[PDB]
Scaffold this active site. Structure first.
Site, PDB file in Angstrom:
ATOM      1  N   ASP A 375       0.937  -1.225   0.024  1.00  0.00           N
ATOM      2  CA  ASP A 375      -0.055  -0.141   0.090  1.00  0.00           C
ATOM      3  C   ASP A 375       1.034   1.313  -0.022  1.00  0.00           C
ATOM      4  O   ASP A 375       0.630   2.184  -0.994  1.00  0.00           O
ATOM      5  CB  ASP A 375      -0.957  -0.008   1.101  1.00  0.00           C
ATOM      6  CG  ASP A 375      -1.902  -1.095   1.071  1.00  0.00           C
ATOM      7  OD1 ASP A 375      -2.190  -1.536   0.250  1.00  0.00           O
ATOM      8  OD2 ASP A 375      -2.233  -1.666   2.331  1.00  0.00           O
ATOM      9  N   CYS A 408      -4.744   0.665 -13.752  1.00  0.00           N
ATOM     10  CA  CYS A 408      -5.154   0.564 -12.320  1.00  0.00           C
ATOM     11  C   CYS A 408      -5.007   1.949 -11.961  1.00  0.00           C
ATOM     12  O   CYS A 408      -4.177   2.554 -12.392  1.00  0.00           O
ATOM     13  CB  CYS A 408      -4.465  -0.210 -11.243  1.00  0.00           C
ATOM     14  SG  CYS A 408      -4.981  -1.935 -11.127  1.00  0.00           S
ATOM     15  N   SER A 409      -5.510   2.311 -10.676  1.00  0.00           N
ATOM     16  CA  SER A 409      -5.152   3.941 -10.088  1.00  0.00           C
ATOM     17  C   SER A 409      -4.988   4.950 -11.103  1.00  0.00           C
ATOM     18  O   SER A 409      -6.287   4.792 -11.909  1.00  0.00           O
ATOM     19  CB  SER A 409      -3.847   3.908  -9.424  1.00  0.00           C
ATOM     20  OG  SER A 409      -3.826   4.967  -8.785  1.00  0.00           O
ATOM     21  N   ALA A 410      -4.308   5.783 -11.463  1.00  0.00           N
ATOM     22  CA  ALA A 410      -4.111   6.609 -12.336  1.00  0.00           C
ATOM     23  C   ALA A 410      -3.551   6.030 -13.760  1.00  0.00           C
ATOM     24  O   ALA A 410      -3.568   6.866 -14.699  1.00  0.00           O
ATOM     25  CB  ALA A 410      -3.395   8.081 -12.160  1.00  0.00           C
ATOM     26  N   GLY A 411      -2.516   4.970 -13.531  1.00  0.00           N
ATOM     27  CA  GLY A 411      -2.025   4.388 -14.787  1.00  0.00           C
ATOM     28  C   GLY A 411      -0.783   5.027 -15.292  1.00  0.00           C
ATOM     29  O   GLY A 411      -0.510   5.053 -16.300  1.00  0.00           O
ATOM     30  N   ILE A 412       0.062   5.571 -14.409  1.00  0.00           N
ATOM     31  CA  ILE A 412       1.273   6.033 -14.729  1.00  0.00           C
ATOM     32  C   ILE A 412       2.267   5.427 -13.706  1.00  0.00           C
ATOM     33  O   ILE A 412       3.289   5.552 -14.069  1.00  0.00           O
ATOM     34  CB  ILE A 412       1.036   7.487 -14.441  1.00  0.00           C
ATOM     35  CG1 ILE A 412       0.907   8.185 -13.171  1.00  0.00           C
ATOM     36  CG2 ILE A 412       0.245   8.244 -15.444  1.00  0.00           C
ATOM     37  CD1 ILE A 412       0.650   9.549 -12.949  1.00  0.00           C
ATOM     38  N   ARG A 414       2.737   2.364 -10.836  1.00  0.00           N
ATOM     39  CA  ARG A 414       2.956   0.934 -10.928  1.00  0.00           C
ATOM     40  C   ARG A 414       2.745   0.440 -12.424  1.00  0.00           C
ATOM     41  O   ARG A 414       3.533  -0.288 -12.939  1.00  0.00           O
ATOM     42  CB  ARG A 414       2.016   0.270 -10.090  1.00  0.00           C
ATOM     43  CG  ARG A 414       1.993   0.599  -8.687  1.00  0.00           C
ATOM     44  CD  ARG A 414       1.126  -0.415  -8.018  1.00  0.00           C
ATOM     45  NE  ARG A 414       0.593   0.368  -6.674  1.00  0.00           N
ATOM     46  CZ  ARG A 414      -0.173  -0.155  -5.629  1.00  0.00           C
ATOM     47  NH1 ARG A 414      -0.491  -1.371  -5.820  1.00  0.00           N
ATOM     48  NH2 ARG A 414      -0.514   0.540  -4.525  1.00  0.00           N
ATOM     49  N   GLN A 455       6.786   6.934 -11.283  1.00  0.00           N
ATOM     50  CA  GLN A 455       6.495   8.040 -10.445  1.00  0.00           C
ATOM     51  C   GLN A 455       7.368   8.590  -9.550  1.00  0.00           C
ATOM     52  O   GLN A 455       7.838   9.856  -9.164  1.00  0.00           O
ATOM     53  CB  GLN A 455       5.220   7.934  -9.644  1.00  0.00           C
ATOM     54  CG  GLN A 455       4.001   8.208 -10.631  1.00  0.00           C
ATOM     55  CD  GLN A 455       3.912   9.762 -10.901  1.00  0.00           C
ATOM     56  OE1 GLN A 455       3.334  10.298  -9.866  1.00  0.00           O
ATOM     57  NE2 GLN A 455       3.708  10.268 -12.012  1.00  0.00           N
TER      58      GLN A 455
END
Ligand SMILES: C[C@@H]1OCC2(CCN(c3nn4ccc(-c5cccc(Cl)c5Cl)c4c(=O)n3C)CC2)[C@H]1N
Length: 473
Positions: A375, A408-412, A414, A455
């Site tokens: 997480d 997933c998430s914002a896609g940038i 992970r 990121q």
């Protein structure tokens, strides 16, 4: 991107804005992936917090962004209080051509072994302390040469022995890149590209990881960050009124020139071409049908999910597949969940996608849902690598399979990490350890196709650790 000060402190930031800045002056600085946007206003210095745990930059009370450059560009045009004058930094540490402590023979060896015409570097002078040396290679035995140019430092200004005196090494380099020095007998000292010292032979990965851990990872990563201002490509389609509510975050958008066009035509997704990839966001309830349209249109047969559906009570990836054995329609797309198989680090869902009224259009889509990502980043890359190895073989076994979907998430964050690891490991799987890999260059190539791919420094190091672990085994 001179407004980012890497080695600046909070007291130094307030002093710089108050003595060399005016109202509306601003700068950004690290904290810790915590960051600080220091702005001068009404004679005061307000500090604004920016947090990046691995998914996006989160500005306290502001919005969420894929890069600090996109953040700064956004507020210098829109909502925060006033960003008017970026305070430029004179530290050359984050430049691709700066090497600080470096011997003159080692610099000649580097330019000879790995350089080409116009390859150059700047280093701290071997003898005269406080001065610098610009070593540049030029030419096409004897056909090429390395020329050294002394850079004196006099009263906090820099010069090459005559002409203009520059307030920073960067201004000098930029000036002599546009107006190159000419030698007496005609040789033009063209500064074409910084010397590529990040490209290493794959077998030497462990040696480089040892050097970077002595950290050096941080210096290389922020050198990559300093060049993100060159990736401010157009993102107009994701800003149109009809497409605002199709984005998980209003300011994390796909580049117009690489976005997936649906045949409305919009989805927050980009094609990543180094096997190619579609990097996209976690679904929203109102984009689930567009997601399946994309999967069908692009002939994708493999999907990688990088997050759990929920992490820390927050929705990270909305469920868009039917329960096991169930059948559901998403617009004109029909999806059966045929079978779910549970591994330790991930779950595999065998899905059958088809267009309604056309049973001939049916194809199997293998959904690989990674579930053990913390997480920060995993402490052991084995699970990620075994996951990607299985994903690669499934993709390779399917004739004419389209791009692999990673999301997933914002896609940038992970998403970019998995894709870059997969690109790098792909080279080693096909060409063994006797091949060249270049981690920063590979990330910059991928960031030019979607904003902010990879990121954090922790993800940047994890990519190295993953490549090292793969080469060892
Ligand atoms: C501490 C010193 O200061 C920083 C330092 C300078 C040299 N160096 C380096 N780092 N780096 C990070 C990303 C990139 C890159 C590569 C290809 C394309 C693009 Cl667009 C980019 Cl940004 C590069 C790069 O080319 N070099 C040469 C290692 C780190 C140290 N010597």
């Amino acid at each position: 991107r001179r407004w980012f000060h890497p080695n600046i402190t909070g007291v130094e930031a307030e002093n710089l804005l108050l003595t060399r800045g005016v109202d509306g002056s601003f700068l950004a600085r690290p904290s810790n992936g915590d960051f600080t946007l220091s702005v001068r206003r009404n004679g005061a210095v307000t500090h604004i917090k920016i947090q990046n745990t691995g998914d996006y930059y989160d500005l306290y009370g502001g919005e969420k962004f894929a890069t600090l450059a996109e953040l700064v560009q956004y507020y210098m045009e829109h909502q925060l209080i006033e960003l008017k004058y970026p305070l430029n930094c004179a530290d050359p540490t984050s430049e691709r051509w700066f090497h600080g402590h470096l011997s003159g023979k080692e610099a000649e060896k580097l330019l000879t072994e790995k350089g080409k015409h116009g390859s150059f570097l700047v280093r701290e002078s071997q003898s005269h302390p406080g001065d610098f040396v610009l070593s540049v290679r030029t030419g096409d035995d004897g056909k090429s040469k390395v020329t050294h140019v002394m850079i004196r430092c006099q009263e906090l200004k820099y010069d090459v022995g005559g002409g203009e005196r520059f307030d920073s090494l960067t201004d000098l380099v930029e000036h002599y890149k546009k107006n190159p020095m000419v030698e007496t007998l005609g040789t033009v000292l063209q500064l074409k590209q910084p010397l590529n010292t990040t490209r290493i032979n794959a077998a030497e990965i462990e040696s480089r990881v040892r050097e970077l851990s002595k950290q050096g990872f941080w210096e290389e990563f922020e050198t990559l960050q300093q060049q993100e201002c060159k990736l401010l490509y157009s993102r107009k389609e994701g800003q149109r009124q009809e497409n605002k509510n199709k984005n998980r975050y209003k300011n994390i958008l796909p580049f117009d020139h690489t976005r997936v066009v649906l045949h409305s035509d919009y989805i927050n997704a980009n094609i990543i071409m180094p096997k190619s990839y579609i990097a996209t966001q976690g679904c929203l309830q109102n984009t689930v049908n567009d997601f399946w349209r994309m999967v069908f249109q692009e002939n994708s047969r493999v999907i990688v999910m990088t997050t759990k559906e929920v992490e820390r009570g927050k929705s990270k990836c909305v469920k868009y597949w039917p329960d096991e054995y169930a059948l559901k329609e998403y617009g004109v797309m029909r999806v059966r969940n045929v079978k779910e198989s549970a591994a330790h680090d991930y779950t595999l869902r065998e899905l059958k996608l088809s267009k309604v009224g056309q049973g001939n259009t049916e194809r199997t889509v293998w959904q690989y849902h990674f579930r053990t990502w913390p997480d920060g980043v995993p402490s052991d890359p084995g699970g990620v690598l075994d996951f990607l190895e299985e994903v690669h073989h499934k993709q390779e076994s399917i004739m004419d399979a389209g791009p692999v979907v990673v999301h997933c998430s914002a896609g940038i964050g992970r998403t970019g990490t998995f894709i870059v690891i997969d690109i790098l490991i792909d080279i080693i799987r096909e060409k063994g350890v006797d091949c060249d890999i270049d981690v920063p260059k590979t990330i910059q190539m991928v960031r030019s196709q979607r904003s902010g791919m990879v990121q954090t420094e922790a993800q940047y190091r994890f990519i190295y650790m993953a490549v090292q672990h793969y080469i060892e085994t």
